[PDB]
Symmetry: C4
Subunit: 252 residues, 4 copies
Amino acid sequence: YRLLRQALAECLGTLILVMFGCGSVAQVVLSRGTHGGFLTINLAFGFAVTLAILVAGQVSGAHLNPAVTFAMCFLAREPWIKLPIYTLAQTLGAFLGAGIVFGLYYDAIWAFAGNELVVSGPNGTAGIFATYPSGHLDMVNGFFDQFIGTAALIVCVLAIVDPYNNPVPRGLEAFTVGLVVLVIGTSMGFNSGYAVNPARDFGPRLFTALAGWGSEVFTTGQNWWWVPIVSPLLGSIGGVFVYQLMIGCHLE
Amino acid sequence: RLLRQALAECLGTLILVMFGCGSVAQVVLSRGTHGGFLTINLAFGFAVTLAILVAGQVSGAHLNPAVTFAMCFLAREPWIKLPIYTLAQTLGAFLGAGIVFGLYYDAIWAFAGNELVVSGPNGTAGIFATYPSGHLDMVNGFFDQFIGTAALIVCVLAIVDPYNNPVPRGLEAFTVGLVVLVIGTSMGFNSGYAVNPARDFGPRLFTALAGWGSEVFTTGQNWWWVPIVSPLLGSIGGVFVYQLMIGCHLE
Amino acid sequence: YRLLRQALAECLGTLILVMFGCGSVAQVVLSRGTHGGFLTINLAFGFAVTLAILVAGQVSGAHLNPAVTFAMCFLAREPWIKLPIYTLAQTLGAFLGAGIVFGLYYDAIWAFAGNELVVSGPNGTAGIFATYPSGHLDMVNGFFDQFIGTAALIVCVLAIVDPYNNPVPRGLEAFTVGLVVLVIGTSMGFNSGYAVNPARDFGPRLFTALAGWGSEVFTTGQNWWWVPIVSPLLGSIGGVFVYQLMIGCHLE
Amino acid sequence: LHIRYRLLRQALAECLGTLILVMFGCGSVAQVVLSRGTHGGFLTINLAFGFAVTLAILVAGQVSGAHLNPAVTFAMCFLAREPWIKLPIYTLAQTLGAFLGAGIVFGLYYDAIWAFAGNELVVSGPNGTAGIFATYPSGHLDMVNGFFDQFIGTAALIVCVLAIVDPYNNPVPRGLEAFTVGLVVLVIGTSMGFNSGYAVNPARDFGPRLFTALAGWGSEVFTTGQNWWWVPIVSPLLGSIGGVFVYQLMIGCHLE
């Protein structure tokens, strides 16, 4: 089964970036403003994407993003049956990567607020794994940020992949995709890292429900959990239209 | 054909302005909490690399009216491209600053209550365009843009020089973004890519119509014209410097 | 004797890595919160690996790690005789690299606590060279960070050196390995730099015993000194199985 | 408009290359020094200096080999890879360009530098502004301690440079050799005890120091720190010899 081989590569790729990325957030969150700021969170996530792509680049294409996989299906570059397989493989591996981080910081997480796990607040530990609405990050505000963030990510990715353009040698394509993740995190109002990945958000959030935080991770922030899963999907369609009209449809 | 290349210049300049100006908004609105000047220069330096890779294979990825002027001076490109690319670069820096305002509309208005102030402690107009500082008046600021733009042109010309060994695709993009980051850290401008006439005037024109009024044009003793003339003069100066020392002797 | 030439390049490679890395740790520790934080420590160690690999890559293969060398031998890629030779060459050079750092910072190190050398505590200078347990980094907790960190390092290394994949050009394999070192330090709870290298730990620790810190560097932390050696060796086996199960055995 | 002489084209490339790194590198130092703890720490000083060397090598790489360092040219001639006549031509073309590079920096920050201490230019101290261009001893950086840092710093730089340039090795693609050399500058500044950037360059040290003598600071820049001025010139020269022997014995001599 050729499809089975590519699912394993996608599962391992998302495991690397989530474990390396969410682990960096834990150091900043748990050690309050001592072991780093926001630049280290965005730098770690950006570099972890480069390593994740390099590990699984030659097997499954190194999408590691349901929005990226959706865009390729929308452009008929890949079969439509590769979306359910990749999405399942990408979510399983962000769940496993988040489980590793919980094992490493088990003692510090439980002692953040005494002996009780708090989903949201001043001493909130659930923000290590999944994004949450801040003071100026309402659903109407949050939906716009992820739409623009994913649209810019798709535009840059489609430029490198484009067969009409000269084939970029292997090695420099991975760094370019990791550069978009770093710039997007610095620009858009999201201090969690790689906020435009549906699989990086649902997986760790699903783990947080069974880790001990309860079901309040799904019924808080005015049911915010579905926003980082639907809006990134829409931005992938917009990014395809933006790129094709300006550049793609006229290349030869 | 010229319409296809002009479309890639608008999208390329939209990427760097939207990415670069978003980082400046984070620092200004969150005073000394989300980072400092290192993140502003790093984001602008990296956004230039992404813009060049997106539109490099179509139009050449100038993204700078000073760079386009220098290319036309050496007869590398037809002189008709200078007005075409300048319009394409300015229109797209105007649009790139419109997305940034949309992202931070609620935070920008609440910075000084419920009104927009051009300059001062609670000044939100400096996110999009550069304004004089205490030690950065018109006379002082004129020479910073002249020297900064000449340094950018000298470094760029060595990269795209056909006499030298051809550079692999992508590697050229990163080092052009290196110059942007280094110039920002060296010269006394804390906004990023302060040597681009299109990135400066484009967002500045938006703020005039966005609600800041015409005070953005009559502040700092009418500073708005300096970020346009000075980089244009610096590009000519940097062309002579490269041709005298390295250019004309390359054979 | 080709084996003699390969051992010399390993000693020089580890000398570059330890001297450049421990020098930044000494700069940060001695100037308490004045010359930067842990971002400089991880960046200096990450970039030092790139230089070390570039210098000795074409002679010894640029292992610079007893755990990485163990993984190659376990995969039947290199003879088992190369393991004892490289391990001694890697340890000798971390011992020498730490000696240069002591010479450069002789006056500043002794002035930390007046005219005395203290292994650990507030005025502790022995943590510049080796790694010591923290409050949340006990023997049980600290063991798994080395196992998890080394497994991730082995997986990334194995992916970029696989013969069945596209041969990565020279000068980009060095950068990729340096990226792993920088990311691992940022994510995992070790603020010393390249904590997943057995030679980087045993070498400098053996130096501090003879430099004047005494034998207390071995008896402190309930005999912690053997953890940074055994655990990365075990993680190399675990890292080999993880990569071979998902990607290694399904390449052909 | 053709020089048509190889020894003169290379000298002009060394002057423009060293002008780029000194102007770009010292500008970041001026921002950090003048704005006390506001525009960044020591990471930006070493990051900008590391990237400035990368840009300078790409500009002059194909014309003169992009040494931009009298210690690198000294090591190249020591191995009989270049004629000995290039040492005075390159050193003069490297010191000239660091002098002009520091002239631009003083022009841009003229108002801030003069107002730093009032209306006088103090070489060293609390309100010191002469450290932007040159390097001066710190509290624990006496003449003996300072000498050792320059020797180890230059020895490590030559070893890394010799590995990339090595003809017997695989030819590194153009544009990546420049990046590796800029990496060494960034790591050396962070590791060794020098918060000025690229402190192992004889041309980057004497040039801006000589300009400081005429700019208004005076001749105290030469007689301060127990005549510290000659150390950043002689010790890197000795370190380059040590770096050559370290690389040749361990790697170079055994390559066939």
